[PDB]
Ligand binder design. Structure first.
Ligand SMILES: Cc1ccc(NC(=O)c2ccc(CN3CCN(C)CC3)cc2)cc1Nc1nccc(-c2cccnc2)n1
Ligand SMILES: CC(C)CCC[C@@H](C)[C@H]1CC[C@H]2[C@@H]3CC=C4C[C@@H](O)CC[C@]4(C)[C@H]3CC[C@]12C
Ligand SMILES: CC(C)CCC[C@@H](C)[C@H]1CC[C@H]2[C@@H]3CC=C4C[C@@H](O)CC[C@]4(C)[C@H]3CC[C@]12C
Lengths: 565, 565
């Protein structure tokens, strides 16, 4: 194929202006400083910029662009979207399992990818972890071509690369481009935007589209690539870089002085002729099965934050298991259970600040994938929390009630012990479902951690311990239902002080003199304003279920309405 | 003033090796890549590297370095050390007020610095805020020139500049380079290390000392600056950068091939001739008066970290003031009073995370000023907390207990109001001192926060409310004394349960049947196990003062034993 664009303009102040470059198959390039449009019109061609400010017409061999054009062409980006704790043969496995595996069977995807790993120089390191900045692995010179093949699995026709060789250890930074030379001969239109090449590839190109000050510059066809500026007064000369002086008139030795050449130039007079010549979603249930495989294999591969909520949980169980040990039934038994039941509820809230890193640590990965048509939004959101949020906020609840229960000496039944295990694994979801809502769809975390714990302290006040709720008169008992650690703390106190006594040496079973005593259980709950009825126990657990579905929806309601551009 | 160094070696693996350069008065330079040794030998000549790993010698006009060599030579650095929210005239005033003017009075410093601001291009914007990243102001081309004049006040001999043009908006990047030429004509030996110049001032220098791979490289003299590489095979050619092709040898068109030409070059053999020829704390009381004037001015002009700790104090005072309001003396008066006293002492303890930014955010400021001999460490530390710690930890305490005391209805005495205002501003310093102890002398905040709020939860348990302390049996009750909000909570509970009744309609002054009642005040305190005597109240305050003196001391001790190099 062949790309072209005529009379392109754009606004957010008008950013770009009328440019009319052509783009033949081969190996193109975009040049210029960072302030110009070296990173702008790449997002115009690949349907990445917003179609509001776009005015001109961009063509693909005379025909206009299809309605599915962005999901057939690669967009290898600068910041690497390859997953860290994953195998390379597993990483290309994930790309092949979504874009093209609708009809071909499971021994047809593995022969197409072996055609790719036999390219790229990859068969030596084909079964290693790619490594992160935190864990050593495959070096940075070999991960950029690893991300190239992830969008080469489907058969493309344009590879919109996005400045590969920046911060890429220049001794082997050419190894990406000499690789790009040999793959360009098969009929691929490599269109990218390199960042400050010195001299070496200035002959090893096919067509430049240098831009400066975000306005306009040609030199579309370029193998001579320098002859346009040696007749304009401002000459690049002996002992001068050719690729740096061209934009040095804004660097201080006007750009309008070299802009005005193109009314009477040597390349504009032929390109307007051709540009005026030609002027006239699959298998939903397969998705969240395979999306579930990455986030689970990511957790096993990185055992530094996974065990970090297991050790600090079972250590904290033993400290509460050692401070409290054999709590008695004396006069200091009401206060001794009011604390240890308050600590288990509040720790299940405040240790759920670490769910902000479930969506915001890889927000750059998500927007690139959904715009490339891998999976639907609801398949990501129903699959992500089903794989990481559930089995990391459930097992650190049942270990944290199995250790503590037979060390304190609570009510030693069988059904009343499976409720305390149930309420902690329900309040920890309804605490984490709050953190998922005010985080998803952002870029930083230091405005969604100072905001969340400043709202988790206003929930800690109305909790039936520091207030004694049935004393605020009218206009501040309607904030009482908005606090998550209430409903866990009430249901934990309901099955705890039923049928117990705290006045040993006397008896008040049915003969109760001497008021202002609080020595039996069932009068203590009356004073704290909670119902003495078996419906009143399960009233909280149907409230947290409605607190989860409300909060989890407005996460998924805001993952749809985000700027996917 | 003339520098000379012969056969320098340096080990942390030896990074550096034998270098043989001579530095003439004029305007020198240091070139090369960032991974090499351009940023390494600047800290060797300017006495910033430690003299341990150094084996070679440096000479100032044949004499070695005196014991006071770093206290006459400025070290203008690449990241700015100018105070952001301060005016330029007072900023250069502070630089003059410490180094030289102990004998002259206050009408000689402005006589010298008016000559300085008449240079430098300062006479337009001499009286504004210089600004920072977060708050705007004077542009970057004027902020870097302010640091130059800041260490130009005392009459120097060498200005060891430290890569000025890093990220410095190239159209006026030559302006500071043009400014350095004119001041150098009067006996200023400028030694700096530029970062990738294009072509222009490469000829407008006096003596390069280009280096690469941290090993060695020559061209000491520089007036032709290119005549060496046209005789070495790897010739810099027409239409090629001369500034890069000298160091493009690290990219591979071998660096060591050029080093073998250095045993037979035209500059190795005559430089060894001369180097083998020539080889054969003031007014301490005045200091902390003036140091406190800066940081107090840094609170006035920056109303984003000062009034932010007043609004969240007074919007919290009403929320506490409205939840509890007119607390009674009936049977739910104990729990309703122990809550709000627990929430006041812990809120002063978790409001200590906002004081670890008091030393950490300006460590790069403190290291540069102490090695240049501005002030002693005991003047900086004792001058810091007098200005930024005292009037910002006390004023959000007495506004927090005045607005709530009559709002709740506590004991309406006169002296019992001056204990609650006193104890909260006594627990606040001891809380802020502990956050000063495990932060002072570090680089990142996110280690001294997840280590400190993991310790201020081990103090929130042993706090007289969630434990009922006389049940921890033997071997964890020795951990009872290591917790800061215990001492603030007991002394607040001591003067608030003394002399009241929580048993309306009955009376237990000397007639108390019906045990487990807690109808009087003094039965509640003995049930918690605190001393019911005027010694036990003031026992906590003398314990808190011993906590302050211990923690403030190790803040001062770990400031001394720091790697100031
Ligand atoms: C078990 C508990 C009970 C109460 C509290 N918090 C408070 O008692 C409290 C009091 C006042 C404020 C208000 N603060 C005022 C100033 N502004 C700026 C911020 C909020 C906040 C919290 C924390 C905890 N525990 C807790 N909190 C956070 C984290 C952890 C934790 C535990 C284990 C592993 N990792 C983290 N544990
Ligand atoms: C703004 C959003 C996030 C918070 C929504 C709070 C609401 C939805 C929560 C707080 C209190 C909860 C209610 C408390 C009482 C009951 C019991 C029963 O009669 C129906 C459910 C119902 C009515 C709960 C439904 C969910 C509930 C109404
Ligand atoms: C490193 C620090 C925090 C712990 C060291 C202990 C210091 C800080 C604290 C902990 C317990 C405190 C002691 C507890 C008991 C008393 C009461 C009286 O007899 C004199 C003060 C004295 C003796 C306190 C002095 C300060 C003290 C010793």
């Amino acid at each position: 194929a062949v790309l072209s664009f005529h009379n392109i303009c754009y606004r957010v102040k008008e950013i770009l202006s009328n440019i009319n470059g052509i783009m033949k198959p081969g190996l193109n390039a975009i040049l210029g400083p960072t302030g110009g449009g070296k990173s702008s019109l790449l997002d115009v061609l690949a349907a990445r910029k917003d179609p509001s400010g776009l005015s001109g017409d961009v063509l693909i061999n005379g025909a206009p662009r299809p309605a599915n054009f962005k999901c057939n062409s690669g967009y290898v980006v600068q910041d690497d979207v390859v997953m860290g704790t994953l195998t390379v043969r597993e990483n290309l496995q994930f790309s092949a399992a979504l874009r093209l595996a609708t009809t071909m069977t499971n021994h047809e995807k593995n022969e197409r990818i072996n055609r790719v790993i036999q390219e790229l120089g990859l068969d030596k390191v084909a079964d290693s972890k790619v490594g992160t900045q935190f864990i050593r692995g495959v070096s940075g010179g070999e991960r950029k071509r690893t991300s190239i093949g992830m969008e080469l699995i489907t058969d493309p026709s344009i590879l919109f690369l996005d400045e590969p060789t920046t911060g890429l250890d220049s001794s082997t930074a050419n190894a990406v481009l000499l690789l790009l030379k040999r793959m360009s001969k098969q009929g691929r239109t490599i269109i990218f935007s390199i960042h400050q090449p010195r001299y070496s590839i200035f002959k090893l190109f096919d067509s430049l589209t240098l831009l400066a000050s975000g306005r306009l510059m040609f030199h579309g066809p370029a193998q001579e690539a320098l002859g346009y500026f040696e007749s304009a007064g401002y000459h690049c000369e002996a002992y001068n870089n050719p690729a740096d002086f061209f934009l040095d008139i804004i660097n201080g030795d006007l750009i309008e002085k070299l802009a005005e050449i193109y009314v009477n130039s040597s390349f504009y007079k032929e390109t307007k002729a051709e540009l005026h010549q030609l002027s006239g979603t699959t298998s939903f249930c397969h998705q969240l099965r395979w999306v579930s495989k990455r986030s689970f294999k990511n957790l096993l591969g990185n055992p530094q934050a996974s065990i970090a909520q297991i050790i600090v949980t079972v250590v904290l169980g033993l400290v509460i298991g050692a401070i409290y040990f054999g709590l008695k039934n004396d006069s200091t038994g009401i206060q001794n259970r009011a604390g240890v039941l308050f600590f288990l509820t509040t720790n299940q809230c405040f240790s759920s600040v670490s769910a902000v890193e479930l969506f915001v640590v890889e927000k750059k990965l998500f927007i690139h994938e959904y715009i490339s048509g891998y999976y639907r939004v609801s398949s990501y959101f129903l699959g992500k929390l089903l794989s990481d949020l559930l089995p990391m906020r459930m097992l650190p609840s049942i270990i944290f009630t199995c250790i503590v229960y037979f060390m304190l000496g609570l009510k030693p039944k069988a059904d009343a012990f499976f409720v305390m295990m149930f309420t902690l694994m329900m309040v920890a979801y309804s605490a984490s479902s709050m953190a998922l809502a005010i985080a998803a769809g952002q870029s930083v975390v230091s405005v969604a951690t100072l905001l969340m714990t400043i709202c988790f302290v206003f929930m800690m006040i109305f909790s039936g311990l520091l207030v004694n709720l049935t004393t605020i008169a009218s206009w501040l008992s309607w904030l009482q239902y908005f606090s998550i650690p209430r409903y866990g703390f009430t249901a934990l106190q309901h099955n705890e002080f039923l049928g117990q006594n705290f006045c040993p040496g006397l008896n008040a079973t049915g003969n109760n003199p001497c008021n202002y005593a609080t020595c039996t259980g069932e009068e203590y709950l009356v004073k704290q304003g909670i119902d003495l009825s078996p419906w009143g126990l399960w009233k909280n657990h149907v409230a947290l279920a409605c607190m989860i579905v409300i909060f989890l929806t407005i996460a998924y309601l805001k993952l749809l309405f985000l700027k996917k551009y």
